Amino acid sequence: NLYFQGADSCIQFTRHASDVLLNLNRLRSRDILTDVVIVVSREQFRAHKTVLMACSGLFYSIFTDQLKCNLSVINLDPEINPEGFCILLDFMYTSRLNLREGNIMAVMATAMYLQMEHVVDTCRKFIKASE
Amino acid sequence: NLYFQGADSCIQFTRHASDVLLNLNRLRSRDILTDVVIVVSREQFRAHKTVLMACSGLFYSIFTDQLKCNLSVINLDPEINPEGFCILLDFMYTSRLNLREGNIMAVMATAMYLQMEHVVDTCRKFIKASE
Ligand SMILES: C[C@H]1C[C@@H](O)CN(c2ncc(Cl)c(Nc3ccc4c(c3)c3c(c(=O)n4C)OCC(F)(F)[C@H](C4CC4)N3)n2)C1
Numbered sequence: 563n564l565y566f567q568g569a570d571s572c573i574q575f576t577r578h579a580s581d582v583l584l585n586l587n588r589l590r591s592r593d594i595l596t597d598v599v600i601v602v603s604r605e606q607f608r609a610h611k612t613v614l615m616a617c618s619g620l621f622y623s624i625f626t627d628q629l630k631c632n633l634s635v636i637n638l639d640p641e642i643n644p645e646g647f648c649i650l651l652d653f654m655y656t657s658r659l660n661l662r663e664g665n666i667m668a669v670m671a672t673a674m675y676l677q678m679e680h681v682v683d684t685c686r687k688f689i690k691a692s693e
Numbered sequence: 694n695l696y697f698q699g700a701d702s703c704i705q706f707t708r709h710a711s712d713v714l715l716n717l718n719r720l721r722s723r724d725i726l727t728d729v730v731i732v733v734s735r736e737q738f739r740a741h742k743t744v745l746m747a748c749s750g751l752f753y754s755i756f757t758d759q760l761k762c763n764l765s766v767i768n769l770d771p772e773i774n775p776e777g778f779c780i781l782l783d784f785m786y787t788s789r790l791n792l793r794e795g796n797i798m799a800v801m802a803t804a805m806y807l808q809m810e811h812v813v814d815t816c817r818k819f820i821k822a823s824e
C-alpha cells in the first residue's frame with residue numbers, strides 16, 4: 563504494498579488521500595465537526611468550510627475574507643438549483659460526479675458559479691458530444 | 694482525460710482527492726481556518742481537527758468526545774518526540790512519510806500512540822529488514 567517510493571525521498575501511501583476524503587465524507591454524513599450551513603433556495607446543506615474552500619474558487623474567496631470566514635450560514639444565489647449543488651457537494655467529498663442528461667445543465671451552471679473549472683470543462687465536453 | 698468511468702454510474706476525477714489534500718496543506722501552511730494547536734513538549738503545531746481525525750484513531754476518539762471536541766489546545770504525552778509528530782503531521786497532509794534511520798523509532802512510537810496502524814506496520818517491516 564500500500565506504499566511506494568516517491569519521486570522525492572519519501573515513501574508515499576497510495577490510498578492516503580482518497581481514504582482521508584472518505585473519512586471526511588463519513589464525518590459529514592454523521593454531522594461531525596461541520597461548521598457551516600449552505601442554503602440553496604429552500605434546502606440546507608451542512609459541510610466543513612475547509613472542504614468547501616479546497617473544492618471551490620467561490621468558497622475559497624469567501625472563507626479567506628476576514629469578515630465572511632466567521633459566518634456559520636452562507637446563502638447562495640436563489641437561482642442555483644439545489645439538486646445541482648447537492649451533486650457537486652457529493653463530488654467534493656467523493657471525487658464522483660453523478661452527471662446525467664436531466665441534471666447536466668444545472669450541474670454546469672452551479673459549477674460555473676462555484677468556480678469549479680475542470681467540472682465546467684467536463685460538462686461542456688459531454689454537451690458538445692450530443693450536438 | 695483527468696476523469697474516468699467509475700465502477701458505479703458516476704464519472705470519477707483521478708486527482709481529486711490528492712488535489713483536495715494539497716489545498717488543505719496550503720491552508721495549513723498559511724494558517725487558514727486552523728482550529729487546534731497540538732502541543733508536543735515544547736513545540737506547538739497548528740492544524741485542522743477534521744484532518745487530524747481523518748488521519749488518526751486517537752484524534753478520532755478525542756474530537757468525537759462531546760467534551761473534548763470543543764478544545765482549542767490538545768497536549769500530547771510529553772514522551773512523544775516532536776520531530777516524530779512533525780513527520781507524521783506532514784504525512785497526514787501530504788501522503789508522504791519522511792522515514793529515515795535516525796527517526797524511524799520515534800515515528801513508530803508516535804504512530805502507535807496516534808493509532809495510525811498501517812504506518813506502524815510499515816515501520817516494523819523496515820526495521821525487520823535491517824535485522
Ligand atoms: C494562493 C492560492 C490562490 C488560489 O487561487 C489557489 N490556491 C488555493 N489554495 C488553497 C485553496 Cl483551499 C484553494 N482552493 C481552490 C481555489 C480555486 C479552485 C479550487 C480550489 C478547485 C477548483 C477550481 O476550479 N478552482 C478555481 O476546482 C474544483 C475542485 F473541486 F475540483 C478543486 C479541488 C480538487 C482540488 N478545487 N486554492 C492557492
Ligand SMILES: C[C@H]1C[C@@H](O)CN(c2ncc(Cl)c(Nc3ccc4c(c3)c3c(c(=O)n4C)OCC(F)(F)[C@H](C4CC4)N3)n2)C1
Pocket residue numbers: 577578579581582585586588589746747748749750751753785808809810811812
Ligand atoms: C464508525 C467509525 C469508526 C472508526 O473507528 C472508523 N471510522 C472513522 N470514521 C471517521 C473518521 Cl474521521 C475516522 N478516523 C480514523 C479512525 C481510525 C484510524 C484512522 C482514521 C486512520 C488510521 C488508523 O490506523 N486508524 C485506526 O491510519 C492513519 C491514516 F492516516 F493513514 C488514516 C487515513 C487514511 C485515512 N486514518 N474513522 C468509522
Ligand SMILES: [Cl-]
Pocket residue numbers: 635636637638
Ligand atoms: Cl450569505
Ligand SMILES: [Cl-]
Pocket residue numbers: 766767768769
Ligand atoms: Cl490536553
